[PDB]
Design an enzyme around this catalytic site. Structure first.
Site, PDB file in Angstrom:
ATOM      1  N   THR A   9       0.847  -1.220   0.000  1.00  0.00           N
ATOM      2  CA  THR A   9       0.000   0.000   0.000  1.00  0.00           C
ATOM      3  C   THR A   9       0.890   1.281   0.000  1.00  0.00           C
ATOM      4  O   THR A   9       2.099   1.307  -0.051  1.00  0.00           O
ATOM      5  CB  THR A   9      -0.878  -0.037   1.187  1.00  0.00           C
ATOM      6  OG1 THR A   9      -0.175  -0.274   2.390  1.00  0.00           O
ATOM      7  CG2 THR A   9      -1.998  -1.036   1.006  1.00  0.00           C
ATOM      8  N   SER A  10       0.198   2.377   0.000  1.00  0.00           N
ATOM      9  CA  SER A  10       0.846   3.649   0.173  1.00  0.00           C
ATOM     10  C   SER A  10      -0.262   4.486   0.688  1.00  0.00           C
ATOM     11  O   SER A  10      -1.390   4.507   0.107  1.00  0.00           O
ATOM     12  CB  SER A  10       1.455   4.225  -1.140  1.00  0.00           C
ATOM     13  OG  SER A  10       2.197   5.388  -0.862  1.00  0.00           O
ATOM     14  N   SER A  47       4.205   0.770   1.879  1.00  0.00           N
ATOM     15  CA  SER A  47       5.178  -0.073   1.268  1.00  0.00           C
ATOM     16  C   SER A  47       5.627   0.625   0.075  1.00  0.00           C
ATOM     17  O   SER A  47       6.765   0.461  -0.336  1.00  0.00           O
ATOM     18  CB  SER A  47       4.504  -1.398   0.872  1.00  0.00           C
ATOM     19  OG  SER A  47       3.892  -2.185   1.927  1.00  0.00           O
ATOM     20  N   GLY A  48       4.894   1.626  -0.483  1.00  0.00           N
ATOM     21  CA  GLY A  48       5.287   2.297  -1.678  1.00  0.00           C
ATOM     22  C   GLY A  48       5.673   3.718  -1.318  1.00  0.00           C
ATOM     23  O   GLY A  48       5.855   4.604  -2.170  1.00  0.00           O
TER      24      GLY A  48
END
EC number: 3.4.25.1
Lengths: 212, 49, 226, 229, 196, 204, 222, 195, 196, 195
Positions: I1-2, I129-130
């Site tokens: 995700t981000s 995660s991004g």
């Protein structure tokens, strides 16, 4: 380490060494491996030092509250059977133990017990425990006699630890002998091993593989 | 080195002859033109020439 | 083991400790640690004690070859590129961390080489266990353009930082000062701190104190003939 | 099994004649990611002590809260312990330490290093260390983490031993700390240009400077670094 | 650690930091990560330090000979040399090289080689480990065909961000400019971009 | 366990003025069990004395190795090898087997015939030449030896002061160590005359 | 992962006399190769002419000096200002150590004082439990350096009369309080030059029938 | 492992090796010899790692006999021991070791004296007036210090040996079904059928 | 995700991405990561899908109980509820939570909470995660006290770069707008943010 | 070691247990026994792991004995085994096991019939006309299924145990020192020694 005891006609001779190593390094040469539990019991030291030293002072605590309640002196078989059940609890916590409880009473005779970490209890007539218990057996079991004098027995206990001490890495320092009688243990004092040796090399004429 | 005893005179002399023989036997290489008289001692027969 | 190598305007000065250890125990209070590839290419070594002494002796061998095969002075790069190449094959199984220093006809140089084959260049580098400490002192006092008489003091105080605060380091402090087109001077035992006090007594013994079992005389001589 | 997640580093400290100077970098790393800037970690406790905390940021914050509560617990009752029989360095220190020893017993420790530095109501410099294991030691100059090999040697030039506590003034003492921060900004990968310097003088109190820069920096010598050949 | 290279109208401009961390202790801080492997074809090294340098020496040996027998190599040629050493010892030699260079016939070209050893042509490259923080910056504000002035700021501004967010990137920003005018080194000290 | 503590062994060496002395114990164990109280760890090639500690078998292998190399030196150049020259050969032989090495720790002790100087040197496993002009100690009671030897020793001793110092140094570590002792031989090496003196000491 | 025991080195030396007792130690504290502190006592007075040092790993080693003095306190309170013997204290230390045996302490304790007869007495404990009476016992990291040199100048260990060649061993004698200062100072002089966890400072406490004396000497500053 | 004692009296070397051989869970054979005649007056007894033992005992017996037929003069015990020492040295550097402990007894006709030698799996030669290998060793090196005297005759030495065996028999928890005795002396290599 | 959150002058805008990977197989590609824990204090989940959800549940039970007996909670009050649960189960549980809310007296506010739990005030926060990829672009393109329409566009540009690099973020870009006016949902489909 | 055997004959249960204990690398007692009376006509021989054997022998003893005074009623050997198994099963599930194998041989008074039960450390009883445990068990089994007849007298069961013993001396790679035999008859539990 090597500690042996044998019943004969007088009682039990206990015989111990005093060399307590840390491995390669020799920690101390004067470590007592006899433990006065009361005046009619002695306990040898083997395996974990700490574990045996502690718990046999603490057996002294259960000897004196046996003594009071029953107003009679403790059985040797009863003494052993306190200690047994204590080390069974701490088994799987991995505390190491090697003790011979030695006693002589007048209602059972001389009786040795070997209390061990496992919960194992064996009575007997000869034991040797230590990291040099193999050397000691050899001499002692050939020259074994039930019908033996107090004088001969004292020299025989000495001599047994000697043999072990000479080849064993972790045995030496001094030996100490006790003779447990009915009326109490009598101390026979401290003999150096390194000084005992040369006396016994001349007199006996043993050790023809050893320089001199 | 291997037997912890000094080499017998017989053994050391047969060994030299075998190397020399070898070149006349195989490889197409000249022989070495050498001749030795060995003076040597061992416990086995004492002096050998 | 604290080893500095400080470049300066007219040369390079490289100084080291005299302590050689084997485990926590001090093998030798004084031992050499600066060794000589070539008379103009000095080096000191940190990391594993045997593999410092042998790898210097060995690329030492081939450079001496090489300097005489070329009829010219042996350059700092010549040494550097053979060390480098040699260390990479064993893929960092030979433990050496050398400060390599030297002058040559094409100027003053100063290198460091890791056990695999990284090589770095500053005007001051240090390797060893002392590396951290050494390096701190340098960055405060150091500037560009230092004289000789300046340089040597900077080298000495730098190793002394090493001695006080690092335990792999101690005893005396060795220096070797190299300037371009002048002889390379080895000042072994330049600065001595930690000079050993007088012992409280002698522990000498009268004759006969210990016990002999037997005696003999054994022969180191060849067989003679009357 | 404890593991830090986010980490802070390097707090350096030394004694001087009339008092102590404590100072730290303020940058909350996350390994490679330099994730926070401005994370104050000089906690003033009363007015005569600064406690500089290093290590895990998670653990630090939980003992930031303990620190404020010591002052509140002291301020119940005792109208004569307002500031005149209040907390000393020596007390604050002990409390800190005996939580960490107890946590080491459990095997779930507070993973930190703590300097406590102040001046006691006796008129005596204090400078001590306690850490994640609970090793106590007093010391006339001190560091945490990787400044215990970097900063430490350099400050040991100035104040060596107990015989030189009253020869180092606050004019040397600021400079020496300033100079270490710089050498740490060079050779340490978890330090930032931001640092906080606090002076505890006993005659002018806690003078707490926030957000100094590292200045007077040399990188000109990098111009004559070319290839290896 | 952050390495990059960007193509522009007159050729290609290479860019590097100078911090090489190992652990928490910075071994060298003035590292020159920009290596000449011919005389108009320079490279950028990142990853396992001894294993990148070892390969580079061998590539240098290949191209010095290539010149002497067959004629001058190209960006393409040099990159190929690089690949085939990483590819055939790909279990133990761990190398990320950006091979950038100015041809007199095809201008600037950039290749990126990651750790497996596969060539890929790109109009700018980034590889490293401090270049995972500037990935989105580099793509949005980059333009293909920028004039000279612009290019030098584009690579500065990125490395300034890399410095900021990555603590394994630091010190001087080194740039080598490869053009038909020649081979020009620029050096940017920290106040000069920490000002921004 | 340790490949150099499985039969123990020690060598001490000291210099004096115009003399050296070297000494070893006579113990060969296989772990806990003592097998022998009469195995040498000192050997002599010429007038050089090479004491070798560490694993049992590599003491012996290494003795016949240098026996081979010393013969070829003497035959070609028509003299007995000097102490200083020999030390370099002790280093190289260890280093040749850099990986999986000889698990020893020899001691070179001599007196040079070309200069008349006491000269001693030491080696670890891999072999780094350890200069001294004090004393060099090696083996499994070496931690004890390094402390004990330094304390008695006064810089320079007479040829028979030197017998009383190096004898006590050796006894007292050897009876505080479990894998050392058990009979010991001390040598006094003067210019041209070596005496081998066995020692009365504790066997238990 | 948490590795909860480290080390802080140090070396201590306990010598039992015949009218005094000596418990000494260095004041250097370390972690790895960095010197933490030049000066830092480890040899704490507990009163009653008992000196204890629980030497090694510091965080344990301060815990058993805390817990020990706490019991000196609570003894004096519930036995109407009783004088703590060497005997009493020893067996009590044994209980304090032994009680943690599923998570042991990792220090080497030694006590010293006079016993009840007007002579010195030194007992030395392993971390687990047990103890024995001494006349010398070093501990700490440079133990194996310092112990065998003390057995050769106090107990006269393997020395015979001069020119008797094994017939009669050398006679033991009493050592003065003055002489024993020389023995302890000399051991640590030799120790510094051969070991890298000892130096800076040496703090001997000497225990007599009038009080406890601290006497501070420097060593080599590395 | 298996018993393996030597004892060297003033006129004979008396070696003994165990009968029982236990490979698997079960004793498979109960009378197997564990010796090889190298030379008429040199005997080598072995016990060690199963299946290394057969190959290393037969390998050395080929090479020593080859040397004997060459010069027609058998090598001393001293020599045999050293050649034995040498291979075991080489075998722990090699990829897979021979871990075979051997006691070599021989009558040396050149010193006109009996001699015994012990070579362990690592390759350490030691002269000894009695010796032993393995766990067997532990119970008899102490018992042997007590009764051994250098100037004994062979029949005295046989009853000492039957004392040694007896001590092993009880205190060992591994069966050996008594020893076989073989004597090495200057009239040849003989056997005793009494345990 | 981000996930991200970014302030502006009327309040704070929260941003997210509705990809949720389990391995490379997407378990659900329209997961809503933007969660209401109080009426005007929202949160952003990332990392392990179980873990985050269990703690958002318990903060919601503790602000249900805060607001019913002690009056309305601020962004702060809610922040310290999250911290103190993440500290007390960091070796059993893992969470990343960005906390963003509107207080009346202090406007929009953004707290961040890493895996060990620490609380840190910021004017913009990024986690997921991004998040690694877009760091440097955020720090260039971020102002403060700017118009609503510029904030909606900063987030658009940032999370379109995040989807561009990271595998584990994609699908629609949700936004939640916390203002004094109310709560406005926005949603952007791929083809709008893919260009911009 | 750990050898216990059962041979049920049609009037007697014959349990025999080992006379050797081995702890460490040597035998400590070679004159021992390993059996405890439960009832005056129920006999339990036990053997298996170190130190569980004694402590679990006496635990169970306290328990059967408690009942037997209390109600002055013997239990059935059937009853007795159920209790022992119940305890053994439970300890696998609990923190600390007991690894011990037991043969409970008794003579029921109610039916007048021998019954032999074999309980493993897991705790499964199973009634057998004959049974064993350990690896010792393997050697013995094959003899019992050849020569057994269920019509045996007391003496026939004794003479059979001689074959089993004779086999064990030969194949067993370890010492065990003979056995004390115990016969659970209908008159008492009477001890005889086998030769």
């Amino acid at each position: 380490t090597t500690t042996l005891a044998f019943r004969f006609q007088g009682g039990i001779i206990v015989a111990v060494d005093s060399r307590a190593t840390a491995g390669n390094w020799v920690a101390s040469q004067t470590v007592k491996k006899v433990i006065e539990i009361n005046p009619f019991l002695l306990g040898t030291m083997a395996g974990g030092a700490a574990d045996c030293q502690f718990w046999e002072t603490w057996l002294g605590s259960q000897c004196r509250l046996h003594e009071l309640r029953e107003k009679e002196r403790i059985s040797v078989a009863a003494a052993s059977k306190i200690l047994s059940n204590l080390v069974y609890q701490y088994k799987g916590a991995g505390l190491s133990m090697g003790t011979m409880i030695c006693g002589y009473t007048r209602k059972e005779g001389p009786t040795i017990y070997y209390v061990d970490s496992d919960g194992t209890r064996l009575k007997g007539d000869i034991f040797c425990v230590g990291s040099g218990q193999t050397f000691a057996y050899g001499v002692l079991d050939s020259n074994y006699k039930w019908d033996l004098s107090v004088e001969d027995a004292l020299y025989l206990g000495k001599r047994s630890i000697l043999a072990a001490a000479h080849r064993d890495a972790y045995s030496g320092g001094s030996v100490n002998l006790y003779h447990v009688t009915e009326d109490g243990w009598i101390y026979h004092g401290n003999h150096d091993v390194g000084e005992l040796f040369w006396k016994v090399k001349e007199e006996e004429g043993s050790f023809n593989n050893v320089i001199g | 080195k291997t037997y912890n005893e000094d080499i017998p005179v017989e053994i050391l002399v047969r060994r030299l002859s075998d190397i020399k023989q070898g070149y006349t036997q195989h490889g197409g290489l000249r022989p070495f033109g050498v001749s030795f008289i060995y003076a040597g001692y061992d416990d086995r027969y004492g002096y050998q020439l | 083991t604290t080893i500095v190598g400080v470049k300066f305007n007219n040369g390079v000065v490289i100084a080291a400790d005299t302590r050689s250890t084997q485990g926590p125990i001090v093998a030798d209070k004084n031992c050499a640690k600066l060794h000589r590839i070539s008379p103009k290419i000095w080096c000191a070594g940190a990391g594993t004690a045997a593999d410092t002494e042998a790898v210097t002796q060995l690329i030492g061998s081939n450079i001496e070859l090489h300097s005489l095969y070329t009829s010219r002075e042996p350059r700092v790069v010549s040494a550097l590129q053979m060390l480098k190449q040699h260390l990479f094959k064993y893929q960092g199984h030979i433990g050496a961390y050398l400060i390599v220093a030297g002058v040559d006809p094409t100027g003053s140089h100063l290198f460091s080489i890791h056990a695999h084959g990284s090589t770095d260049v500053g005007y001051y580098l240090s390797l060893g266990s002392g590396s951290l400490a050494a390096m701190a002192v340098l960055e405060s006092h150091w500037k560009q353009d230092l004289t000789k008489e300046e340089a040597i003091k900077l080298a000495s105080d730098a190793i002394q930082a090493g001695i006080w605060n690092d335990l792999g380091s101690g005893s005396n402090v060795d220096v070797c000062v190299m300037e371009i087109g002048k002889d390379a001077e080895y000042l072994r035992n330049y600065l001595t701190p930690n000079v050993r006090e007088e012992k409280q007594k002698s522990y000498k013994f009268p004759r006969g104190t210990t016990a002999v079992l037997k005696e003999s005389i054994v022969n180191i001589c060849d067989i003679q003939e009357e | 099994t404890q593991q830090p997640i986010v980490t802070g580093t390097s707090v350096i400290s030394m004694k001087y004649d009339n008092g102590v100077i404590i100072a730290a970098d303020n940058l909350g790393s996350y390994g490679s990611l330099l994730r926070f800037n401005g994370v104050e970690r000089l906690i003033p406790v009363g007015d005569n002590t600064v406690v500089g905390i290093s290590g895990d940021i998670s653990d630090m914050q939980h003992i930031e809260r303990l620190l404020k509560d010591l002052v509140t617990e002291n301020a119940y009752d005792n109208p004569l312990a307002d500031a005149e029989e209040a907390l000393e360095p020596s007390y604050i220190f002990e409390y800190l330490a005996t939580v960490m020893y107890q946590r080491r017993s459990k095997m779930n420790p507070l993973w930190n290093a703590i300097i406590v530095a102040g001046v006691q109501s006796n008129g005596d410099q204090f400078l001590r260390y306690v850490n994640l294991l609970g090793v106590t030691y007093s010391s006339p100059t001190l560091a945490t983490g990787f400044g215990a090999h970097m900063a430490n040697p350099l400050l040991r030039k100035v104040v060596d031993r107990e015989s030189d506590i009253p020869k180092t003034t606050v004019q040397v003492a600021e400079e020496a700390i300033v100079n270490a921060m710089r050498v740490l900004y060079y050779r340490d990968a978890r330090s930032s240009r931001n640092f906080s310097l606090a002076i505890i003088d006993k005659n002018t109190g806690l003078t707490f400077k926030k957000n100094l820069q590292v200045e007077n920096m040399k990188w000109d010598f990098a111009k004559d670094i070319k290839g290896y050949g | 650690t952050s390495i990059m290279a960007v193509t522009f109208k007159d050729g290609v401009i290479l860019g590097a930091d100078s911090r090489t961390t190992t652990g928490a202790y910075i071994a060298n801080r003035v590292t020159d990560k920009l290596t000449r492997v011919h005389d108009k074809i320079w490279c950028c090294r990142s990853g396992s330090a001894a294993d990148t340098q070892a390969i580079a020496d061998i590539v240098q040996y290949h191209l010095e000979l290539y010149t002497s027998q067959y004629g001058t190599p190209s960006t393409e040629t040099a990159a190929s040399v690089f690949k085939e050493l990483c590819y055939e010892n790909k279990d133990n030699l761990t190398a990320g090289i950006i091979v950038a260079g100015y041809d007199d016939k095809n201008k600037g070209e950039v290749y990126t080689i990651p750790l497996g050893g596969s060539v890929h042509k790109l109009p700018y490259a980034i590889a490293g480990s401090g270049s995972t923080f500037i990935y989105g910056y580099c793509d949005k504000n980059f333009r293909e065909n920028m004039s000279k002035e612009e290019t030098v700021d584009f690579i500065k501004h990125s490395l300034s961000q890399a410095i900021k967010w990555d603590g394994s990137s630091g010190g001087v920003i080194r740039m080598v400019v490869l053009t038909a005018a020649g081979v020009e080194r620029l050096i940017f000290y920290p106040d000069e971009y920490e000002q921004l | 366990s340790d490949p150099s503590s499985i039969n123990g062994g020690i060598v001490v060496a000291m210099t004096g003025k115009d003399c050296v002395a070297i000494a070893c114990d006579l113990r060969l164990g296989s772990q806990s069990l003592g097998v022998s109280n009469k195995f040498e760890k000192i050997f002599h090639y010429g007038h050089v004395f090479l004491g070798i500690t560490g694993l049992a078998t590599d003491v012996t292998t290494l003795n016949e190795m240098f026996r081979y190399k010393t013969n070829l030196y003497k035959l070609k150049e028509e003299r007995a090898i000097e102490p200083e020259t020999f030390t370099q050969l002790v280093s190289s032989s260890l280093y040749e087997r850099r990986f999986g090495p000889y698990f020893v720790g020899p001691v070179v002790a001599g007196i040079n015939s070309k200069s008349g100087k006491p000269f001693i040197a030491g080696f670890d496993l891999i072999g780094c030449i350890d200069e001294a002009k004090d004393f060099i100690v090696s083996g499994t009671a070496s931690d004890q030896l390094f402390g004990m030897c330094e304390s008695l020793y006064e810089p320079n001793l007479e040829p028979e002061d030197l017998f009383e110092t190096i004898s006590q140094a050796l006894l007292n570590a050897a009876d505080r160590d479990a894998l050392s002792g058990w009979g010991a031989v001390v040598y006094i090496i003067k210019k041209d005359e070596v005496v081998k003196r066995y020692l009365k000491m504790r066997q238990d | 992962q948490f590795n909860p025991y480290g080390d802080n080195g140090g070396t201590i030396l306990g010598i039992a006399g015949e009218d005094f007792a000596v418990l000494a130690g260095d004041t250097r504290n370390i972690t790895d190769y960095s010197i933490n502190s030049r000066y830092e006592p480890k040899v704490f007075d507990c009163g009653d002419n008992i000196v204890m040092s629980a030497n090694g790993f510091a965080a344990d080693g301060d815990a058993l000096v805390k817990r020990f003095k706490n019991s000196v306190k609570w003894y004096h309170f519930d036995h109407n200002d009783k004088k703590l013997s060497i005997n009493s204290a020893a067996r009590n230390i044994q209980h304090l150590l032994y009680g943690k045996r599923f998570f042991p302490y990792y220090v080497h304790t030694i006590i010293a004082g006079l016993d009840e007869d007007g002579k010195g007495a030194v007992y030395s404990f392993d971390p687990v439990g047990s103890y024995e009476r001494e006349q010398c016992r070093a501990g700490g990291a440079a133990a194996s350096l310092i112990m065998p040199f003390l057995d050769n100048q106090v107990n006269f260990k393997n020395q015979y009369e001069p020119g008797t060649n094994g017939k009669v061993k050398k006679p033991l004698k009493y050592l003065s309080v003055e002489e024993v200062i020389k023995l302890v100072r000399d051991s640590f002089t030799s120790a510094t030059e051969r070991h890298i966890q000892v130096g800076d400072g040496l703090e001997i406490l000497i225990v007599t029938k009038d009080g406890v004396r601290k006497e501070f000497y420097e060593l080599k500053r590395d | 492992m298996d018993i393996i004692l030597g004892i060297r009296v003033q006129d004979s070397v008396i070696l003994a090796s165990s009968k029982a051989v236990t490979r698997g869970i079960s004793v498979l054979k109960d009378s197997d010899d564990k010796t090889r005649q190298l030379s008429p007056h040199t005997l080598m007894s072995f016990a060690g790692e199963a299946g290394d033992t057969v190959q290393f005992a037969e390998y050395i017996q080929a090479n020593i006999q080859l040397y004997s037929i060459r010069e027609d003069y058998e090598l001393s015990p001293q020599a045999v021991s050293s050649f034995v020492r040498q291979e075991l040295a080489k075998s722990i550097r090699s990829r897979r070791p021979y871990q075979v402990n051997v006691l070599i007894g021989g009558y040396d006709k050149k010193k006109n004296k009996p001699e015994l030698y012990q070579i362990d799996y690592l390759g350490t030669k030691v002269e000894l007036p009695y010796g032993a290998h393995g766990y067997s060793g532990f119970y008899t090196f102490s018992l042997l210090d007590h009764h051994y005297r250098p100037d004994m005759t062979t029949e005295e030495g046989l009853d000492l040996l039957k004392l040694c065996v007896q001590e092993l028999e009880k205190r060992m928890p591994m069966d050996f079904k008594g020893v076989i005795v073989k004597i090495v002396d200057k009239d040849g290599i003989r056997q005793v059928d009494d345990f």
